[PDB]
Design a protein around this ligand. Structure first.
Ligand SMILES: [Cl-]
Length: 109
């Protein structure tokens, strides 16, 4: 387990998502962020070799979420579909979780 997703980064700037994804080793390492050029839309950012690619998360009339053709009731479902179906029309790029760098625990009383 019941965990928050390691892929939702809220309002991190496009350039910050590139900075962070640039240090991931593995093609497909990705995050969802909340676009700053289109308030209320999401964007998908994904490591590919020396590049970081960005995808608009598109909405149909009912609020369902898609990248190209196949659409879902949630970002979570969209993301999970694209773990095994390429996000790209030019390369086979499958979504995989960031490595992370996770949280040293501290107690603050
Ligand atoms: Cl595919």
């Amino acid at each position: 387990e019941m965990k928050p997703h390691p892929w939702f980064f809220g309002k991190i700037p496009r350039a910050k998502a590139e900075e962070m994804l640039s240090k991931q080793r593995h093609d497909g390492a990705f995050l969802i962020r909340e676009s700053e050029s289109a308030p209320g839309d999401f964007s998908l950012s994904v490591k590919f070799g020396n590049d970081v690619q960005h995808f608009k998360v598109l909405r149909d009339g009912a609020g369902k979420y898609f990248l190209w053709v196949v659409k879902f009731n949630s970002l979570n479902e969209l993301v999970d579909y694209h773990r095994s179906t390429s996000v790209s029309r030019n390369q086979q790029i499958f979504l995989r979780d960031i490595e992370q760098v996770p949280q040293q625990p501290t107690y603050v009383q």
